Design an enzyme around this catalytic site. Structure first.
Site, PDB file in Angstrom:
ATOM      1  N   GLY A  77      -3.840   1.975  -1.045  1.00  0.00           N
ATOM      2  CA  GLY A  77      -3.494   1.941   0.298  1.00  0.00           C
ATOM      3  C   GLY A  77      -3.057   2.928   0.798  1.00  0.00           C
ATOM      4  N   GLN A 101      -0.265   8.203   1.370  1.00  0.00           N
ATOM      5  CA  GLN A 101       0.212   9.486   2.141  1.00  0.00           C
ATOM      6  C   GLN A 101       1.524   9.724   1.646  1.00  0.00           C
ATOM      7  OE1 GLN A 101      -1.749   8.267   6.345  1.00  0.00           O
ATOM      8  NE2 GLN A 101       0.280   7.777   6.060  1.00  0.00           N
ATOM      9  N   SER A 123       2.100  -0.203  -0.591  1.00  0.00           N
ATOM     10  CA  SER A 123       3.025  -1.016   0.284  1.00  0.00           C
ATOM     11  C   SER A 123       2.965  -2.628  -0.019  1.00  0.00           C
ATOM     12  CB  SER A 123       2.551  -0.905   1.654  1.00  0.00           C
ATOM     13  OG  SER A 123       1.257  -1.380   1.695  1.00  0.00           O
ATOM     14  N   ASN A 131       8.184   9.892   4.864  1.00  0.00           N
ATOM     15  CA  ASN A 131       7.598  10.248   3.310  1.00  0.00           C
ATOM     16  C   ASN A 131       8.371  11.503   2.894  1.00  0.00           C
ATOM     17  OD1 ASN A 131       5.813   8.155   3.671  1.00  0.00           O
ATOM     18  ND2 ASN A 131       3.964   9.326   4.330  1.00  0.00           N
ATOM     19  N   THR A 153       2.398  -2.672  10.898  1.00  0.00           N
ATOM     20  CA  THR A 153       0.996  -2.875  11.063  1.00  0.00           C
ATOM     21  C   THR A 153       0.230  -3.989  11.387  1.00  0.00           C
ATOM     22  OG1 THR A 153       0.289  -2.297   8.681  1.00  0.00           O
ATOM     23  CG2 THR A 153       0.864  -0.322   9.952  1.00  0.00           C
ATOM     24  N   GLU A 207      12.963   4.231 -21.104  1.00  0.00           N
ATOM     25  CA  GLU A 207      14.193   4.250 -20.993  1.00  0.00           C
ATOM     26  C   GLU A 207      14.675   3.865 -19.547  1.00  0.00           C
ATOM     27  OE1 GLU A 207      15.714   8.323 -21.458  1.00  0.00           O
ATOM     28  OE2 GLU A 207      17.711   7.667 -21.008  1.00  0.00           O
ATOM     29  N   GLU A 259     -10.389   2.976   3.048  1.00  0.00           N
ATOM     30  CA  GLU A 259     -10.918   3.538   4.680  1.00  0.00           C
ATOM     31  C   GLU A 259     -11.041   5.108   4.518  1.00  0.00           C
ATOM     32  OE1 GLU A 259      -9.212   4.838   7.915  1.00  0.00           O
ATOM     33  OE2 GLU A 259     -11.478   4.297   7.965  1.00  0.00           O
ATOM     34  N   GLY A 302      -3.122  -4.795   3.496  1.00  0.00           N
ATOM     35  CA  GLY A 302      -4.059  -5.816   2.868  1.00  0.00           C
ATOM     36  C   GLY A 302      -4.383  -4.957   1.525  1.00  0.00           C
TER      37      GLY A 302
END
Ligand code: GTP
Ligand code: GTP
Ligand code: A1BMG
Ligand code: A1BMG
Ligand code: GDP
Ligand code: GDP
Ligand code: MG
Lengths: 423, 123, 423, 424, 430
Positions: A10, A15, A132, A220, A171, A246, A63, A136
């Protein structure tokens, strides 16, 4: 050798992957062309006959726009075309579409590309899955992939870095649905999952970095630092958390309760002491998931220092907070910490909004307080499922309505499990 | 506290700090099954799409029956107009010829009477 | 989810459809000859959503123009941007529809519908990934109404997995063209409930009331009403045409805006209203009844979901502030069982002539007022069987009339049911 | 494409046809030989290889006198001789002779010539039938034609322009009989019928045009202006067009209630605003049928403007009309307004009585008040029929008395129907 | 509907028939040789209604001349325009009917009628479109009454779809040729009620009264009476001979003037009344023409129109005058005298105008009425019939030829029936 394969699913997963692999290259001195002037970095990077170092990574985003970033990005030469898997239609914010409709279409191709990476490992530890909760694809395909990785790699560890949904940068209205659905299906198939609450990361960028409207890149850049701290002893010759097994040893006493809380300090806008950054580890304003540890008990607690940190300072810092603060562990577990120092200095992206610091620390603790994040999600789920709002988009993809309630029952049991041990 | 050394390596060291021991001693799908569920969700997709197209095909045939009924109405308007017109035209022809025949019949009775008059004279 | 196929049918459909292509061509920098002359690459990034790639650096609208009457075609052809359309995408009949839904749907419409589907099928194959269809038409007439809903039904049979989106102009006695509009409109609302995924309700009643009351136009014309329509259509397609965080497409719009399949009729809104401002005003004016393109008081119901786009340079922080402020102040006009049902998007490019604009897509239970008004005008005629013989003469049964109005009243009840639902 | 065939029956229909086709030639610039120096006029004119534009029309009359004037008049080369159809004996003011005795001898020839005109159409809209009520041919032969047209062409659109009879310009005393008989027989076969009251046209010619004793020629030139307004939406490409199907849809709420009321303004003796001429259409003085609409309810209003007219002005004019309480619409009509605007100004025959104007309007309105005109006709019928006066002339040609009462009962049902549709 | 076939029978028939042809020939510009010498084209437009075009640029009247007496047609050839008639259309016997209806209808006239049908067929088959027949005859004699009504019957058999029209001269004791004229007239009226569509009632009583009272002729002659007859015949055929609005013909007249088939006996009127060969020093005005036309002194039937009611009225004005002024005098006369028009026949008074006046007059009006007052004529005949038939006076003149008393009783019954139905509609209400 102790190779780990990273899987990004996704848009969020890809990203953030870009952010982490960029940061890894800056830490290990790998140039954007893959060239490079301690050999532990080979756990994450393979090497080609031309002397190029290639991330052990697969990217899945149906996408083409997002994966086209990777193809034409700054570090585009690091990656080979068979590591990037795209399509034409994404999941349209629909778990059922990602899991059942596209999942049945692409799962064998995705596992085939993963197999080609695993055949280059002499001692594959397992997988690091970035995705995420709310998308979807990030929710629906990831859960199918985790199901199949348990089949195809039964004895291998699987860790996740999961993006917990937040209204500020949402979103889709159905993100609570996708979140509960993927947590239910993945629960048996993950050994250790580090959740990253987008709202917590948003709040840290505003307060500590003086950013009015944090972007995906802002979030990010901060998430990469946490991932780096968690993986640093895998990529260098460290002492604590030197293999994926571990992590569940040091943090996961019970298999379902495998959601550690990450706290990180310092976040400085572009030199604090060991004692100051240690105190910051016990301020909820620095957690990656919004919850209150006063409402819970610790099961395990590790401190991962990085940079200029000397043991006598750590033990003095720990001694200070023990006298002034109450840190309730569960009865059956010792009250204390596992401490690790990684000498490799904290690295920031040049020109970023994070400043280079001398020393940093990331605390990984398994508290029952993280059940509050599940309770917030479960309530939003309940508000919409009571009216069956939007359920028809999931049923239209072949999912049965019963899976909603079966998933919600599993989240009820998870909340009760957190109650039972935080007794 | 109680410090416990764990490890020392090239790029770092680790240890364990214990502040208090525990109050309590101790601690208190297959590949075929997956494909079975993915295939069942697909057949539900296909069933739903088959039922949608079935309804749309039912509307196609209603559209044909509407267009057909309008053509039947026009044909019946024609057939009823045709029989009605031929009915009145033949009724008008029968009436008119019947009137002309009675008119010529009366004038012929007079013709017979004029013969009786001329016969009575010679008598 | 790349290309949309656009269809315009009937006189109204082709007038506002032409105004639409006029407007977005100026936004993306296309002159009537099809050449690009704009000043930014934002304009060309997703221009293939609506324009086909012709050889010679030429952009041709992916538009199909339909009418049973040849006059409208000529008017479009001689219009401002008449030369930009593909000349073999004009599909026109010869004998008109006579303001009769039964003629557009059954008789005259059937004889032309396969010629239209051929041109639809040709544009569909030149598509890398067909996102769906958008249709412009009126419901009060015969061609756009009766043949348009026939087109929708046939397109759904041939592309059952594509999104169907319509801009549907509602009739008003204030701007009528034929005495049988209540019949034509009710018979089409029945079709739209069953066979579309998203419908923008463009109410001529509201467009007139806005021109007379707000714009101080004593005698509104179609040119005045169509100015509102072109502004609304530009606003509600901005997220499809320009890049952003949501990667918005028509299937995602339906997933997040349609909690129940039948309730897919949107209340458009626009600010500022202009004849041929600040952020706190844009936010307020947008939820104001005087800005709704459907003649319904949103304060007479509750919003299920709201999608809002802001265009122009402005603080998204200030915008996001005000949107949350309005939601909290007017909390009783939003359903409580749908967390985060108001989404904000932003686009840096303002519409022509304006420096800031805001466009509102609302799914409000107040839209039942539009359908109750049509139902009252329908029953007023139908109880006396006024003009019914022009429809029975085409082959229709009276049952189709009663069934269509029962379905429309059920939609009214359905909107009412979720107006009264609580948590 | 979209052709309309015009049929003119009897003296009244033929002479009005003369006024109309002459005006069409002037409107479209066609010379009396059919030659001509917007191709919408093709709906009414076919074209020969030589570039000659021939009307899509049949002229039928049972007696040759009137059509012989066409055959030797100004436009004798405008028509093909086969379009001008005459017998040798007229109906002698007798419906029975026009419909049966004399009409059956020429009906097949008329249909054959109409079928040859239909064969020259790629999209026939329908027929326009011009005739009078009172004449023996205008009544009886038109009824026969309408019946035969329903058989040959099914439900294809058939519209009429009917001349309602008036004592001032009468030709027969049995005109009320012919009127009721043809109205009964034609009712099922006509989709829409525009009535023109000769007395109403007679009075307009006196008041507005200062003509002391109006002749047919004076009456017909005003009637041709109304006819031109109706068909201009089909012969010219204007802003708002109204085809034959839209007339029927927007003016006829029930199959029997299909008699719109025509009005025209301005009527000026050889510039008024859009608002003025629009308000004039609701003044009873400009109506083509004598009745009082303020005593009735409108069911449909079709306004056909021509010339220098802007839609904003029509919207403003109609909005004013919608405020007047003296203009009442039925409960079941949310809106009864239909508007057409053709941009070519109204043409006037040089040497006529009407003045050239920059804008004009013809309103077609379906009002319950037109039943007043049906009442006056039915009363004249009853006066004579109560004694069976003149009925023997119809029975002698084959008709039966039952046909009279059956026709008069249909007119009673029609009068009651106007009453029913007017309630709330 | 163009050609009319004219027939004149008996002495009175041929006398008023000849005068009719002299008068309308002058009106159409035809001299006694058949040549057109007129100045206007309207004289020739509908001239084929009464004239055939014989080669040589000539016009022959479409006329058939009949008499059982040979002498009366010798006088026709001898009179002015005697040479204009087709010589083969003269059909003469050698013994008259002795003023005996039975001789004309049953015995001698029947032995000559086929010879007449010869000429009738030749003129009828030569017609493009035959309107019908007009017959001039007296009802009081034998040939015109008896053979005339026989001729009607025979012609109606061969041409039943054509119009049958007569100018029928009623007998009067003031101008009498025998005492059995009430018999001859009643027997003829029986035939006319059944076999004609239109009959103009020319009453010798009214003609004598007009000549004596209004024209002050102390001893009027047939020439005096026939000046009124030819003025009337010209007036009531004007709409058939000249172009007008109504495209008038014999059938349209019958359709609009005869509401009930038996009530087809017209009362003609004429203004101004004049003596023959007399110059009119002052012409009449439109109000004078209109008032004098509905005056009882101007009726060619001895009936007071104010004693009954008009069913229908047709009026023709001749000369140059305002059709507007005519229209307002006529409508005024109707509205003022509203009680002499039936109320249940709307628009029952029709007006026509012709610009060409008749010879000697600048302006004239002619009146055709279907009035119920015409029952006074038939009552007068019926009383005279009964006074004789009570006594069976002169019956042997008729039985001697073949007849029977029953034929007298029947004809008297039918005429008294005709009187009753005139009275029925006189009293009928709306
Ligand atoms: N921190 C962070 N979160 C992201 C980023 N991109 C997306 N998200 C979050 O991810 C969630 C949406 O899921 P995504 O993974 O981006 O989208 P996806 O699964 O590909 O969605 P589909 O269109 O359904 O296929 C939202 O909650 C976003 O806030 C990112 O770059 N950084
Ligand atoms: N407005 C107008 N009315 C006319 C005209 N000609 C005749 N009429 C009317 O038509 C009615 C008579 O019918 P016509 O059409 O003339 O008669 P027809 O159809 O030829 O029938 P017949 O002559 O009886 O065989 C009367 O009411 C006249 O007033 C005309 O030219 N213009
Ligand atoms: C915001 O503006 C637009 C958004 C979309 C669009 O795809 C979209 N809406 C949502 C959404 C809707 C409602 C509540 C929500 N909570 C979280 C997401 C969400 C998610 N995606 C399309 C548009 O027009 C083409 C827009 O412009 C008006
Ligand atoms: C008026 O003058 C004449 C008319 C005709 C003639 O055909 C005719 N009469 C009528 C008529 C008669 C009565 C009442 C009426 N209401 C309406 C029409 C009408 C219609 N047609 C013939 C004549 O002589 C041969 C005439 O001359 C005296
Ligand atoms: N807003 C708007 N409405 C229109 C326009 N043209 C027609 N309409 C409306 O459309 C309806 C009539 O249908 P129309 O499109 O003209 O007929 P069609 O050609 O058969 O589809 C009426 O409600 C009109 O008010 C226009 O340009 N703008
Ligand atoms: N008005 C008029 N009446 C005539 C004329 N000649 C004869 N009569 C009348 O006709 C009747 C006699 O009939 P007549 O024609 O002489 O007998 P016929 O020749 O045998 O038919 C009497 O009533 C006479 O008054 C005439 O020239 N003018
Ligand atoms: Mg005629």
């Amino acid at each position: 050798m102790r190779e780990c394969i990273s899987i990004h699913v996704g848009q969020a997963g890809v990203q953030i992957g870009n952010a982490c692999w960029e940061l890894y290259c800056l830490e290990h001195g790998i140039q954007p062309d893959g060239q490079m002037p301690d050999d532990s970095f080979n756990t994450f990077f393979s090497e080609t006959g031309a002397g190029k170092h290639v991330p052990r990574a697969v990217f899945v985003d149906l996408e083409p726009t997002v994966i086209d970033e990777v193809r034409t990005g700054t570090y585009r030469q690091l990656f080979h075309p068979e590591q990037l898997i795209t399509g034409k239609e994404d999941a349209a914010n629909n778990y059922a579409r990602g899991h059942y409709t596209i999942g049945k279409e692409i799962i064998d191709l995705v596992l085939d590309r993963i197999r080609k990476l695993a055949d280059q490992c002499t001692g594959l530890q397992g997988f690091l899955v970035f995705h995420s909760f709310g998308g979807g694809t990030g929710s629906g395909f990831t859960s199918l992939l985790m199901e199949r990785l348990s089949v195809d790699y039964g004895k291998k560890s699987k860790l996740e870095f999961s993006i917990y949904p937040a209204p500020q940068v949402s979103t889709a209205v159905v993100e609570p649905y996708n979140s509960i659905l993927t947590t239910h299906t993945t629960l048996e198939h993950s050994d250790c999952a580090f959740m990253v609450d987008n709202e917590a990361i948003y709040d840290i960028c505003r307060r500590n970095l003086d950013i009015e409207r944090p972007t995906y890149t802002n979030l990010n850049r901060l998430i990469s630092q946490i991932v780096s701290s968690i993986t640093a002893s895998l990529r260098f010759d460290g002492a604590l958390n030197v293999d994926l097994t571990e992590f569940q040893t040091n943090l996961v006493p019970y298999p379902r309760i495998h959601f550690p809380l990450a706290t990180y300090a310092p976040v400085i806008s572009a030199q604090l002491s060991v004692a100051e950054i240690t105190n910051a580890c016990f301020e909820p304003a620095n957690q990656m998931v919004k919850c209150d540890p006063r409402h819970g008990k610790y099961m395990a607690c590790c401190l991962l220092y990085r940079g200029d940190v000397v043991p006598k300072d750590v033990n003095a810092a720990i001694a200070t907070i023990k006298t002034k603060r109450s840190i309730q562990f569960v009865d059956w577990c010792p009250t204390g910490f596992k401490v690790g120092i990684n000498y490799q200095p904290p690295t920031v992206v040049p020109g970023g909004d994070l400043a280079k610091v001398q020393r940093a620390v990331c605390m990984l603790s398994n508290t029952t307080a993280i059940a509050e994040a599940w309770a917030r999600l479960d309530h939003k789920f309940d508000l919409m499922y009571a009216k069956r709002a939007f359920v028809h988009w999931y049923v239209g993809e072949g999912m049965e309505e019963g899976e909603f309630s079966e998933a919600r029952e599993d989240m009820a049991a998870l909340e009760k499990d957190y109650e039972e041990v935080g007794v | 506290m109680e410090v416990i050394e764990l490890n020392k390596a090239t790029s770092g060291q680790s240890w364990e700090v214990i502040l208090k021991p525990p109050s309590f001693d101790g601690v208190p799908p297959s590949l075929e099954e997956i494909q079975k569920k993915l295939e069942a969700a697909e057949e539900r997709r296909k069933y739903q799409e088959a039922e949608l197209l079935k309804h749309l095909a039912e509307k196609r045939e209603h559209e044909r029956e509407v267009i057909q009924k309008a053509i039947e109405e026009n044909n019946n308007f024609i057939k009823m107009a045709k029989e009605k017109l031929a009915q009145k035209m033949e009724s008008n022809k029968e009436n008119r010829e019947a009137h002309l025949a009675a008119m010529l019949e009366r004038l012929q009775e007079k013709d017979k009477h004029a013969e009786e008059v001329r016969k009575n004279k010679e008598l | 989810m790349r290309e949309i196929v656009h269809i315009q049918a009937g006189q109204c459909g082709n007038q506002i459809g032409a105004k639409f292509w006029e407007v977005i061509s100026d936004e993306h920098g296309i002159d009537p000859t099809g050449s690009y002359h704009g000043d930014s690459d934002l304009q060309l990034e997703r221009i293939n959503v609506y324009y086909n790639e012709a050889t010679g650096n030429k952009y041709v609208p992916r538009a199909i123009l339909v009418d049973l009457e040849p006059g409208t075609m000529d008017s479009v052809r001689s219009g401002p941007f008449g030369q930009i359309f593909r000349p073999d995408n004009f599909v026109f009949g010869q004998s008109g529809a006579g303001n009769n839904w039964a003629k557009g749907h059954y008789t005259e419409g059937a004889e032309l519908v396969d010629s239209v589907l051929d041109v639809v099928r040709k544009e569909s194959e030149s598509c890398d990934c067909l996102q769906g269809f958008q249709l412009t038409h009126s419901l009060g007439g015969g061609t756009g109404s009766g043949m348009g809903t026939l087109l929708i039904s046939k397109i759904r049979e041939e592309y059952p997995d594509r999104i169907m989106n319509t801009f549907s102009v509602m009739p008003s006695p204030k701007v009528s063209d034929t005495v049988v509009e209540p019949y034509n409109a009710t018979l089409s609302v029945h079709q739209l409930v069953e066979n579309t995924d998203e419908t923008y309700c463009i109410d001529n009643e509201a467009l007139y009331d806005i021109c007379f009351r707000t714009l101080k136009l004593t005698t509104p014309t179609y040119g005045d009403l169509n100015h509102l329509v072109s502004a609304t259509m530009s606003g509600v397609t901005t997220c499809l045409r320009f890049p952003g965080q949501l990667n918005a497409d028509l299937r995602k719009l339906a997933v997040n805006m349609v909690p129940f399949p039948r309730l897919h009729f949107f209340m458009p809104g626009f600010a500022p209203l202009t004849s041929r401002l600040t952020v706190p005003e844009l936010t307020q004016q947008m939820f104001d009844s005087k800005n709704m393109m459907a003649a319904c008081d949103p304060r007479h119901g509750r919003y299920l979901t709201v999608a809002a786009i802001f265009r122009g340079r402005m603080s998204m922080k200030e915008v996001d502030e005000q949107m949350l402020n309005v939601q909290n102040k007017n909390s009783s006009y939003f359903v409580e069982w749908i967390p985060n049902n108001v989404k904000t998007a932003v686009c840096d490019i303002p519409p022509r002539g304006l420096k800031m604009s805001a466009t509102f897509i609302g799914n409000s239970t107040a839209i039942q007022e539009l359908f109750k008004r049509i139902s009252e005008q329908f029953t007023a005629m139908f109880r006396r069987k006024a003009f019914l013989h022009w429809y029975t003469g085409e082959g229709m049964d009276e049952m189709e009339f009663t069934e269509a109005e029962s379905n429309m009243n059920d939609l009214v009840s359905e909107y009412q049911q979720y107006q009264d639902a609580t948590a």
